[PDB]
Assembly symmetry: C2
Homo-oligomer: 208 residues x 2
């Protein structure tokens, strides 16, 4: 009967995409926040962390670490990973590009200050030139409401999460992609995601 | 069966782990080498690279990009991804930890010659303190010949490939881990992997 338990810092970091996915799935979960280095040593010393790191999620009697391992398990368990191996391949290709873009945005605060300007420019170029056009093309190719299989999958969730982060970075970047704008609205208006986006959910704020 | 066709530089890089997995699965595949900037421009312009990047593999009607996407599909198609959602979860956790360590080694040649001694040292400390102990513990916990489900999976293949790279870095690192040494020998002796390690295969040499 035990709800999934997510162990991380009280912050977005590498746990946030899991919070979105669980919420979009309608899954009830607890969080246990790491507040001290003592908290983190105790997880380690208890053997909770296969590679000594968080995020870790306790779910269905496993102690899963590695964001991709957590997410793949959630996605399959809740029917958000496509109908078969070939839909899962499209999903994977899409969401690994999202992950590549997300990683650049995620690590930007820790970019060497003398590299920061150039890096920001390069990031926005890739959004405008590489990533946003790729996803708009997928959407234009089939004219369907969802990225894959005409049904909600983790790819729609991970993409719309990413679109919120790009909006924080620069709200003009999505301007010229109306199908992306339209997906953002539809997905944000799904009861589970609409509730997640409202004040009070486990959704975490940006880092200062 | 249209043979899968892998597009990459004639080099290990980001395609090497897919050549390992394909070869281990007994799958015959063709390669097409990118030799110049023009060669890559053509693939981009031709609409073959979803995110304008290689590796890309033509398989089963798809133009799959993103290493993880490419390998998840191959692993599922050739029954190297465990037999269920929970064995997949253990595989993903193991192989994501493998990718983290392997990413570090992969990028070691392209960092600044002063952030290099410290970076080499840190990699060695992670190998001896974090990664090899984790994998040794899995092998010792069941005593079985393979990481997961008592049967070859992509995890044994990804791990043993990484053991070859750790050996090129420092052949002393594996010395205190007798079960990883036994796995490397056993896996290297399977018919398909023995063939891959012998001359004249798609296996690629270190860069220089």
């Amino acid at each position: 009967a035990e709800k999934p338990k997510a162990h991380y810092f009280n912050a977005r970091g590498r746990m946030e995409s899991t919070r979105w996915l669980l919420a979009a799935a309608g899954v009830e979960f607890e969080e246990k926040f790491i507040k001290s280095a003592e908290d983190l040593d105790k997880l380690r010393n208890d053997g909770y962390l296969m590679f000594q790191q968080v995020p870790m999620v306790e779910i269905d009697g496993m102690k899963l670490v590695q964001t991709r391992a957590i997410l793949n398990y959630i996605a399959s368990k809740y029917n958000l990973y496509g109908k078969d191996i070939k839909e899962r391949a499209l999903i994977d290709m899409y969401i690994e590009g999202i992950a590549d873009l997300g990683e650049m945005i995620l690590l930007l605060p820790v970019c060497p200050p003398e590299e920061k300007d150039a890096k920001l420019a390069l990031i926005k170029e890739k959004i405008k030139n590489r990533y946003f056009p790729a996803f708009e093309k997928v959407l234009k190719s089939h004219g369907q409401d969802y990225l894959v299989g005409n049904k909600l999958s983790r790819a729609d969730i991970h993409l719309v999460e990413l679109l919120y982060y790009v909006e924080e970075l620069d709200s003009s970047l999505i301007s010229s992609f109306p199908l992306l704008k339209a997906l953002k609205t539809r997905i944000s208006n799904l009861p589970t995601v609409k509730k997640f986006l409202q004040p009070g959910s486990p959704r975490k704020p940006p880092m200062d």
